[PDB]
Design a protein around this ligand. Structure first.
Ligand SMILES: OC[C@H]1O[C@H](O[C@H]2[C@H](O)[C@@H](O)[C@@H](O[C@H]3[C@H](O)[C@@H](O)[C@@H](O[C@H]4[C@H](O)[C@@H](O)[C@@H](O[C@H]5[C@H](O)[C@@H](O)[C@@H](O[C@H]6[C@H](O)[C@@H](O)[C@@H](O[C@H]7[C@H](O)[C@@H](O)[C@@H](O)O[C@@H]7CO)O[C@@H]6CO)O[C@@H]5CO)O[C@@H]4CO)O[C@@H]3CO)O[C@@H]2CO)[C@H](O)[C@@H](O)[C@@H]1O
Ligand SMILES: OC[C@H]1O[C@H](O[C@H]2[C@H](O)[C@@H](O)[C@@H](O[C@H]3[C@H](O)[C@@H](O)[C@@H](O[C@H]4[C@H](O)[C@@H](O)[C@@H](O[C@H]5[C@H](O)[C@@H](O)[C@@H](O[C@H]6[C@H](O)[C@@H](O)[C@@H](O[C@H]7[C@H](O)[C@@H](O)[C@@H](O)O[C@@H]7CO)O[C@@H]6CO)O[C@@H]5CO)O[C@@H]4CO)O[C@@H]3CO)O[C@@H]2CO)[C@H](O)[C@@H](O)[C@@H]1O
Ligand SMILES: OC[C@H]1O[C@@H](O[C@H]2[C@H](O)[C@@H](O)[C@@H](O[C@H]3[C@H](O)[C@@H](O)[C@@H](O[C@H]4[C@H](O)[C@@H](O)[C@@H](O)O[C@@H]4CO)O[C@@H]3CO)O[C@@H]2CO)[C@H](O)[C@@H](O)[C@@H]1O
Length: 628
C-alpha cells in the first residue's frame, strides 16, 4: 500500500515545476497536506479491508485524492473556517444548545425561495439544525418521495435551482442554523445516467449495479434476504424489459449501487465532495445497512458496509472536515450502534427510543423503555444519538427480542398488538394510524400516521396534547440531538387524500406527509387551541433545554421509580426527569425519593416540588426537577 507522502507528490505532478512551487507554499496545500498525514492511513486501511489486492484500488485512490485536492482548493473560505472550528470542537453535536427540525421544501414552503422566507420562523422556534428532504432531480410521478435520485447535482426544477439551494444554505448559516441533506448512496433511480449506461452495456459503467441474466442467483440470494418493500415486489430483485434481473431492495425504479466495484465508491465520493462544497454541515446516510451484499447472508450490516462508511469519513476529514454523518440504520439495536463512531457516523438515528416511546403510550408500561435507556443509551465519546418522535417514514417496531424475552415479552406477539393498536384495530385505542408494508408471509407490518393522529388528536382526545408533549420531552432531554418533524409542533393531522392520489395510493407514508397547515400555524400563540398548547409546550421545553447546562451531553443514568407507568432518569446528576405514561395519576413514593433533595424546582411547571413526600403525577405529566 502507498503512503501519504508518496501520494501527495503525485497529486502535485499535475502542475508544472513553476506552478508546483507555488502550490507547495500555499495555505490550502498546507492544510490538505497535514490532514492527509493524519487521516490517509485510515482511508487506505478501510479501502484495503474491502477491496484487498484489487488492481483498480490504487488507480481509483489516486484519482480520488486528486479530486479531493481540487475540491478542497475550490472550497469557499467561510466553509474552511467551519472546517477548522469543528476539527477543534468534535462535540458540537452533543451540546444541549442543538435542536433540529426536518421538512419537505415543497410541502412545507412550496420551493427553495419560499423556504428561505420560513427561516425567521425556524429562529422563532429555536432551531439550530435544519434537515431538508430530497431536493435533487428524480423520476416524475413515482420517485419514492425523492429517494429515487436521477442526479446528485441537479436540483429538482420544481424546487428551484442549484443557485437557490446555495443561497438557502448561506441564509441558514447567517441565521446560525446548520444545513442537513440526504446522501442517498445505496441506490439511484433507474433513470440516473449511470443506471442507463450500465444497462446499455457502456464499458465505462460496467458493474455499477447488480444485474443478472436470469433468476438463478436472485433466487439464491432471496433464500436469505428480508423483504423491505414486499408490496412492490418479492425478494430483492426486479426484472428489466429485456428479461434480465436487477437488485432492487426498495422500489423497482431504485437500483442498488454496486460498491464491490471500487469505481462506484470513487463516483459516490465525488458526489459527496460536491455536496460538501455547497456548505452542507451534515449528510444523512440513507439506508446504510444495505451497501454490501454477500450470498447466504441477509445482506444487511455486513463488515464491508462499515468499512466503506469509515472510508467516506476519512475523505471528509481530508477534504471537508466540517461535514459530519448522520447514520440512518433502522435495524436491530445491536447493529444500530455499530454505525456510530467518531471515525464512522458521528451521529445516528435512535429508532430504539423512538419505537419504545410509542410502545409505552400503548401499553402504559415503561419496562422496555427503561431497559433501553439503562443499557443502550450511552455512546462512545464524540458521538450522539439523533432522538426523534416521528419522521417522513413509517414506524418500525425496533427492539431486541432477546431483551423483551428477559421481561417476559414475546416479540412477535407484542408487535401484533402494537400494530393493531396503532391502526385502531384494538378496543379502546386512541391511535388513528394506517398500515404500511403488511407482509402476509411474515405477519410483519409498520405504521403510518402523524404524531397527532397516533395520540388521538384527530378525534379531539382530551389527552392528545399532553401525550405529544410527553413524547417530545423525552427526545429533548435524554441526551442527544433532538429532531422535530416540522408540523408536529402545532398538531398537524394526516393527509387523508393520499389514498385517492394515483401516485401515492400505494405508499401509506404519504398519510403523514401533509402540507403546511396555515390554519394551525396561525393558532400557535393561542393557548386556547391545541396548536397553541402544543407549540408553547414544546417551545418552552426547547427554551429550557438550550439555556440550562444540566441537559448538556448525551449521557444519562436511569432512576427506578418503582411505578411501572413512570419513566425516570437523571442528567449530569443535576436534572431528574419523570414522565407518566398512564392516563391516570401515578405516584412515586417518598420512600423511593429518600436520596433526593428535600425540595426541587420543576422546570416544566415552574413550581417547587417536595420530594420528602409522595409525588403524584397527573396523567401524562412531565417533570424536570433540578436536584443540583
Ligand atoms: O431509500 C429507500 C428508503 O430508505 C430510508 O428508509 C428505509 C431504511 O433505510 C431501511 O432500513 C428500511 O427499514 C425497514 C426495515 O428494513 C424493515 O425490515 C422494517 O423493520 C422493522 C420491522 O418491521 C419490525 O418487525 C422490527 O424488526 C425486529 C423483528 O421484529 C424482531 O423479530 C427481530 O428480528 C431479528 C431476529 O430476532 C433475528 O433472529 C434475525 O432473524 C433471522 C433468523 O435468525 C433466521 O433464522 C431467519 O429466519 O431470518 C431471520 C431474518 O433475517 O434477525 C432479525 C432482524 O434483525 O429484530 C428486528 C429489529 O429489532 O423492527 C424493524 C426496525 O428495526 O421496517 C423498517 C422501516 O421502519 O426501510 C426504510 C423505509 O421504510 C428512507 O428514510 C426512506 O424514506 C426510503 O424510502
Ligand atoms: O372514546 C372513543 C373510543 O371508544 C372505544 O374505546 C373504549 C373501549 O371500548 C372501552 O372498553 C374502554 O376502554 C378502556 C378500558 O375500560 C380501561 O380499563 C383502559 O384499559 C386498560 C386495561 O383494562 C388494562 O388491562 C391495561 O391494558 C394494557 C396492558 O396493561 C398492557 O400490558 C398492554 O397489554 C398488551 C401486551 O403488552 C401485548 O404484549 C399483548 O399481550 C399478548 C402477549 O403478547 C401474548 O404473548 C399473549 O400473552 O397474549 C397477550 C394478550 O393479552 O396484548 C396486550 C393487550 O391485549 O396493553 C394493554 C392495553 O393498553 O391498560 C388499559 C389502558 O389503561 O382503557 C381503555 C381505553 O380508554 O373505554 C374506551 C374509551 O371510551 C374505541 O375502541 C376507541 O377506538 C375509541 O377511540
Ligand atoms: O456506577 C454508578 C453508581 O450508581 C449508584 O447509584 C445510581 C443507581 O444505579 C441508579 O439506579 C439511581 O439510583 C436511584 C434508584 O434508581 C431509585 O430507585 C432510588 O433508590 C431507592 C430504592 O428504590 C429503594 O428501594 C430504597 O433503597 O431507597 C433508595 C433511595 O436511597 O434512588 C436512587 C438514588 O438516586 O441513581 C444512582 C445515582 O444517580 C450505585 O449505587 C453505585 O453502586 C454505582 O457504582
Amino acid at each position: 500500500s502507498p503512503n501519504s507522502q508518496y501520494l501527495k507528490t503525485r497529486i502535485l505532478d499535475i502542475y508544472t515545476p513553476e506552478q508546483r512551487a507555488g502550490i507547495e507554499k500555499s495555505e490550502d496545500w498546507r492544510q490538505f497536506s497535514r490532514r492527509m498525514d493524519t487521516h490517509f492511513p485510515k482511508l487506505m486501511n478501510e479501502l484495503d479491508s474491502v477491496y484487498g489486492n484489487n488492481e483498480a484500488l490504487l488507480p481509483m485512490l489516486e484519482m480520488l485524492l486528486a479530486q479531493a485536492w481540487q475540491s478542497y482548493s475550490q472550497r469557499n473560505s467561510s466553509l474552511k473556517d467551519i472546517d477548522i472550528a469543528r476539527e477543534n470542537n468534535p462535540d458540537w453535536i452533543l451540546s444541549n444548545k442543538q435542536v433540529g427540525g426536518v421538512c419537505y421544501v415543497d410541502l412545507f414552503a412550496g420551493d427553495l425561495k419560499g423556504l428561505k422566507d420560513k427561516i425567521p420562523y425556524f429562529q422563532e422556534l429555536g432551531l439550530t439544525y435544519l434537515y431538508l428532504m430530497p431536493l435533487f432531480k428524480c423520476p416524475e410521478g413515482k420517485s419514492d418521495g425523492g429517494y429515487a435520485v436521477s442526479s446528485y447535482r441537479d436540483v429538482n426544477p420544481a424546487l428551484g435551482t442549484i443557485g437557490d439551494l446555495r443561497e438557502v444554505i448561506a441564509a441558514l448559516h447567517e441565521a446560525g442554523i446548520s444545513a442537513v441533506v440526504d446522501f442517498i448512496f445505496n441506490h439511484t433511480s433507474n433513470e440516473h445516467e449511470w443506471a442507463q449506461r450500465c444497462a446499455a452495456g457502456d464499458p465505462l459503467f460496467d458493474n455499477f449495479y447488480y444485474i443478472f441474466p436470469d433468476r438463478r442467483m436472485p433466487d439464491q440470494y432471496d433464500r436469505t434476504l428480508r423483504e423491505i418493500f414486499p408490496d412492490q415486489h418479492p425478494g430483492g430483485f426486479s426484472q428489466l424489459e429485456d428479461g434480465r434481473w436487477v437488485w432492487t431492495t426498495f422500489n423497482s425504479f431504485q437500483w442498488d449501487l454496486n460498491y464491490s466495484n471500487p469505481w462506484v465508491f470513487r463516483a459516490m465520493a465525488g458526489e459527496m465532495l460536491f455536496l460538501a462544497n455547497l456548505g452542507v454541515d451534515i449528510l444523512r446516510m440513507d439506508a446504510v445497512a444495505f451497501i454490501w451484499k454477500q450470498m447466504g447472508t441477509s445482506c444487511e450490516n455486513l463488515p464491508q458496509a462499515h468499512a466503506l462508511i469509515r472510508a467516506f469519513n476519512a475523505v471528509m476529514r481530508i477534504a471537508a472536515p466540517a461535514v459530519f454523518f448522520k447514520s440512518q440504520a433502522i435495524v436491530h439495536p445491536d447493529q444500530v450502534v455499530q454505525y456510530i463512531g467518531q471515525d464512522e457516523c458521528q451521529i445516528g438515528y435512535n429508532p430504539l427510543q423512538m419505537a419504545l416511546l410509542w410502545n409505552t403510550l400503548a401499553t402504559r408500561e415503561v419496562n422496555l423503555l427503561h431497559q433501553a435507556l439503562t443499557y443502550r443509551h450511552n455512546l462512545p465519546e464524540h458521538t450522539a444519538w439523533v432522538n426523534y418522535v416521528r419522521s417522513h417514514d413509517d414506524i418500525g417496531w425496533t427492539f431486541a427480542d432477546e431483551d423483551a424475552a428477559y421481561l417476559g415479552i414475546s416479540g412477535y406477539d407484542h408487535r401484533q398488538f402494537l400494530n393493531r393498536f396503532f391502526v385502531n384495530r384494538f378496543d379502546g385505542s386512541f391511535a388513528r394510524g394506517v398500515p404500511f408494508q403488511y407482509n402476509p408471509s411474515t405477519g410483519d407490518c409498520r405504521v403510518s400516521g402523524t404524531a397527532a393522529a397516533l395520540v388521538g388528536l384527530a378525534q379531539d382526545d382530551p389527552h392528545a396534547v399532553d401525550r405529544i408533549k410527553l413524547l417530545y420531552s423525552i427526545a429533548l432531554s435524554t441526551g442527544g440531538l433532538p429532531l422535530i418533524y416540522l408540523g408536529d409542533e402545532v398538531g398537524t393531522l394526516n393527509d387523508d387524500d393520499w389514498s385517492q392520489d394515483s401516485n401515492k395510493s400505494d405508499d401509506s407514508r404519504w398519510a403523514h406527509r401533509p402540507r403546511y397547515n396555515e390554519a394551525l400555524y396561525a393558532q400557535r400563540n393561542d393557548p386556547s387551541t391545541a396548536a397553541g398548547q402544543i407549540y408553547q409546550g414544546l417551545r418552552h421545553m426547547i427554551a429550557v433545554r438550550q439555556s440550562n447546562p444540566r441537559f448538556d451531553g448525551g449521557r444519562l443514568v436511569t432512576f427506578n421509580t418503582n411505578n411501572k407507568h413512570i419513566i425516570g432518569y437523571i442528567r449530569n446528576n443535576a436534572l431528574l426527569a419523570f414522565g407518566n405514561f398512564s392516563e391516570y395519576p401515578q405516584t412515586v413514593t417518598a420512600h423511593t425519593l429518600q436520596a433526593m433533595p428535600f425540595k426541587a424546582h420543576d422546570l416544566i411547571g415552574g413550581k417547587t416540588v417536595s420530594l420528602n413526600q409522595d409525588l403524584t403525577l397527573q396523567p401524562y405529566q412531565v417533570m424536570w426537577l433540578e436536584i443540583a
